[PDB]
Amino acid sequence: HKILHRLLQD
Amino acid sequence: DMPVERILEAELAVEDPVTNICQAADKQLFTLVEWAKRIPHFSELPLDDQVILLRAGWNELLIASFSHRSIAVKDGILLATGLHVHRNSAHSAGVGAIFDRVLTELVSKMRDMQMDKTELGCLRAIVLFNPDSKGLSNPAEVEALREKVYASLEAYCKHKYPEQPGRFAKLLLRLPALRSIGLKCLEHLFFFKLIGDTPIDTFLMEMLEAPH
């Protein structure tokens, strides 16, 4: 979930 | 509030065959994150819930998108990379059966009813706001968002297609097919990973990881 978390930053 | 105008804007903003298909899936996963952020109220969910919904829904969300993109294609699909893939090529690659299901249960039915982009966007937002996703901090909140989407979709259908009273039900009744096709596509991807003969890029691979 590393990539997904990073892309969900505001 | 869940305006269909915002859902349409989100669709418009983001606009071996197996290797090409997997390459396009990896590319579209990045775009899928940007799409979800444009759906009303998604970005206000807790970060952990946004992760849960995207990990639960990504395959169905991407299948719905490429299926609708392919409505003018004869017997094939149009990938987001620009490549058209014909059913003959899919058959020749050993994925004929699932490819034919996409064509018969999704692309052709979208074509025959002339499903529009607002309707597609609303179906995708319904898929995204899946209150059955395990681990959600507040399932009732996700259920409420789904309820607002389908209420807005029904009002849209009644206003735009008043002569088609069954249209809203018809749209919702493609969701079981999408669910089944998504599950079968997922089995294929796990198999490609197991065999090791198909390149799988980093984001697609992360979606195939076990959940935390």
Ligand SMILES: O=C(O)c1ccc2c(c1)N[C@@H](c1cc(C(F)(F)F)cc(C(F)(F)F)c1)[C@@H]1[C@H]3CC[C@H](C3)[C@H]21
């Ligand atoms: O370009 C795009 O917008 C795009 C975006 C995403 C995707 C695709 C295309 N292709 C999907 C696909 C389709 C078939 C079909 F339709 F051709 F039969 C067979 C297979 C199989 F796994 F079996 F190889 C896989 C992959 C799977 C992961 C998320 C969806 C489903 C993903």
